[PDB]
Amino acid sequence: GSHMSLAIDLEVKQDVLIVRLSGELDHHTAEELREQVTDVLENRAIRHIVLNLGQLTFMDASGLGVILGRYKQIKNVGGQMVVCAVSPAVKRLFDMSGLFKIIRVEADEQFALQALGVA
Amino acid sequence: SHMSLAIDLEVKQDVLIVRLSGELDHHTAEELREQVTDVLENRAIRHIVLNLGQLTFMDASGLGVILGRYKQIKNVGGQMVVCAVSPAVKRLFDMSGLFKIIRVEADEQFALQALGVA
Amino acid sequence: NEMHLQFSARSENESFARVTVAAFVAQLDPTMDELTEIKTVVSEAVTNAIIHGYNNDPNGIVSISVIIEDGVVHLTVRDEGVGIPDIEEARQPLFTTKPELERSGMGFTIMENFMDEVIVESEVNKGTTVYLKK
Amino acid sequence: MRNEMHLQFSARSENESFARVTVAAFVAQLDPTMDELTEIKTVVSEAVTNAIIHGYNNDPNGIVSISVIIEDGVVHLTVRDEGVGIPDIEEARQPLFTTKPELERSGMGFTIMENFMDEVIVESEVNKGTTVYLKK
Ligand SMILES: Nc1ncnc2c1ncn2[C@@H]1O[C@H](COP(=O)(O)OP(=O)(O)OP(=O)(O)O)[C@@H](O)[C@H]1O
Ligand SMILES: Nc1ncnc2c1ncn2[C@@H]1O[C@H](COP(=O)(O)OP(=O)(O)OP(=O)(O)O)[C@@H](O)[C@H]1O
Ligand SMILES: [Mg+2]
Numbered sequence: 461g462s463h464m465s466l467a468i469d470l471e472v473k474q475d476v477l478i479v480r481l482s483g484e485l486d487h488h489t490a491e492e493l494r495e496q497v498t499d500v501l502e503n504r505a506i507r508h509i510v511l512n513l514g515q516l517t518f519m520d521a522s523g524l525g526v527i528l529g530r531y532k533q534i535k536n537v538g539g540q541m542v543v544c545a546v547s548p549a550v551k552r553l554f555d556m557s558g559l560f561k562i563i564r565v566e567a568d569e570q571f572a573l574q575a576l577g578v579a
Numbered sequence: 580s581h582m583s584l585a586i587d588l589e590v591k592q593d594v595l596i597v598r599l600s601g602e603l604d605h606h607t608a609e610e611l612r613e614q615v616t617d618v619l620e621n622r623a624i625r626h627i628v629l630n631l632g633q634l635t636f637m638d639a640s641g642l643g644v645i646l647g648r649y650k651q652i653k654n655v656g657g658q659m660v661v662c663a664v665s666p667a668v669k670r671l672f673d674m675s676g677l678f679k680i681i682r683v684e685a686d687e688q689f690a691l692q693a694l695g696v697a
Numbered sequence: 698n699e700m701h702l703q704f705s706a707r708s709e710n711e712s713f714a715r716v717t718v719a720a721f722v723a724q725l726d727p728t729m730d731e732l733t734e735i736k737t738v739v740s741e742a743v744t745n746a747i748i749h750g751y752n753n754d755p756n757g758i759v760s761i762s763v764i765i766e767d768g769v770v771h772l773t774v775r776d777e778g779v780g781i782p783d784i785e786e787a788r789q790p791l792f793t794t795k796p797e798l799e800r801s802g803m804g805f806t807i808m809e810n811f812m813d814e815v816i817v818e819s820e821v822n823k824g825t826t827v828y829l830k831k
Numbered sequence: 832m833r834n835e836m837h838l839q840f841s842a843r844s845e846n847e848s849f850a851r852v853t854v855a856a857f858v859a860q861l862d863p864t865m866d867e868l869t870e871i872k873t874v875v876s877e878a879v880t881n882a883i884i885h886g887y888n889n890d891p892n893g894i895v896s897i898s899v900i901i902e903d904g905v906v907h908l909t910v911r912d913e914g915v916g917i918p919d920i921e922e923a924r925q926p927l928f929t930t931k932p933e934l935e936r937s938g939m940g941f942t943i944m945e946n947f948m949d950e951v952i953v954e955s956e957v958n959k960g961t962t963v964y965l966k967k
């Protein structure tokens with residue numbers, strides 16, 4: 461839907477980029493996310509990313525792809541990426557890809573910010 | 580197998596009230612036809628009031644089942660009144676020219692008044 | 698952009714079919730009315746195929762195509778069913794060959810009023826095709 | 832008894848959501864659970880995306896064909912591909928393997944399909960096409 465089928469929300473808290481997702485995260489949609497995020501990383505010195513999946517309706521391997529791509533971006537700058545408000549459906553995919561061994565998970569945004577020494 | 584159209588029926592004296600919720604299509608209109616003709620066999624019904632207020636969709640299968648029910652009511656000297664008709668549905672009553680044979684009312688109280696029940 | 702959908706001729710698939718169609722066309726951001734007409738038209742043509750074209754025999758298959766281009770919705774419904782003998786006669790308002798099933802004979806009339814065009818091609822015992830444009 | 836649906840559509844990413852939702856709709860007739868449905872939609876999306884990114888390289892003139900033959904409570908799903916194919920299918924069957932890293936693909940596609948379905952048969956001949964059969 462031109463972001464309907466998804467809805468991306470971004471906010472920088474000092475050196476941290478928060479990405480809040482609402483909708484389905486698939487090939488079509490994960491490409492748009494990638495475009496907006498990589499765009500913010502070029503324009504600002506972002507060290508950490510927090511990904512709020514609380515309102516996420518769906519996710520496929522296209523969702524894992526864009527997440528790892530973002531982690532490698534964050535990895536080089538010596539940062540951390542934290543996902544929060546993850547539903548079981550989505551948590552499951554993190555278990556197969558073994559994405560967890562590289563991405564910290566938290567209950568909500570506040571605990572993700574605490575994990576990044578911001579709060 | 581009914582969640583595509585919910586059918587609510589109630590007999591008030593010699594009047595059968597049919598209130599519809601959902602879509603009224605081929606599949607769905609056939610189930611309506613069955614419950615109604617069934618009530619007509621078990622009870623001496625002269626008039627029918629069709630409340631279309633919560634109706635989401637209707638096709639020519641809707642007209643068909645209504646027309647078949649009119650002929651049934653015509654036979655006993657009765658009247659059929661449809662009420663709370665949406666524009667979309669009203670439009671179809673205009674093509675088939677179903678109006679020439681079916682009275683239309685604002686809604687269920689006025690339908691009943693037209694039938695001298697209230 | 699194009700979509701094609703086939704399915705066994707069971708009345709239980711009719712809603713699914715028209716909803717599927719409306720979902721694909723929604724990419725042209727139509728109105729609720731514009732959508733309502735399309736879904737009705739689809740429902741009208743698909744029902745014809747099932748009751749007439751296959752005589753309510755589920756082993757039959759209904760084929761719906763939706764080719765969208767330059768804002769135009771090119772909808773086609775086909776069936777390899779019974780076919781239509783006299784088409785100039787079926788096109789006659791209030792005409793039907795299934796009055797035992799309470800069919801009112803309003804189909805093509807509706808399709809005609811909802812669509813900017815309606816072409817019904819057919820050969821007996823081969824099946825049929827109905828092309829609509831909006 | 833059985834009921835079947837077939838869906839074809841242009842290889843564009845804007846149709847993907849549409850396709851899996853359509854499949855999920857048809858399958859819904861077996862009154863599945865939200866998890867059962869989610870796995871199927873995930874699976875459909877996984878296979879359909881494979882066809883679109885690894886058969887037709889994002890090119891839309893391609894056509895993806897999904898078949899859903901339901902019978903005796905079983906869902907028999909299939910996907911097609913008249914585009915480029917898999918030269919070493921068995922090697923593709925290897926966890927994490929991908930041709931597209933510039934496109935950030937992780938090689939999960941099949942691993943996901945195998946874990947969500949009771950069966951996964953991938954047939955293919957190069958330059959001819961690719962066909963993934965899933966059962967549940
Ligand atoms: N796919 C088809 N195969 C064979 N005959 C068909 C087909 N579609 C329509 N017809 C014939 O054309 C006549 C026309 O259409 P309409 O579509 O007006 O019919 P009905 O189905 O009789 O009416 P209604 O839409 O009110 O149910 C039908 O009565 C039927 O005999
Ligand atoms: N329809 C297809 N046509 C041609 N090659 C295919 C097709 N489907 C899969 N493949 C090949 O199988 C390999 C693997 O699968 P997966 O499906 O796991 O891949 P990805 O697409 O690389 O991974 P992911 O699903 O995580 O993005 C692909 O990299 C691709 O080369
Ligand atoms: Mg008809």
Ligand SMILES: [Mg+2]
Binds near residue numbers: 880
């Ligand atoms: Mg893949």
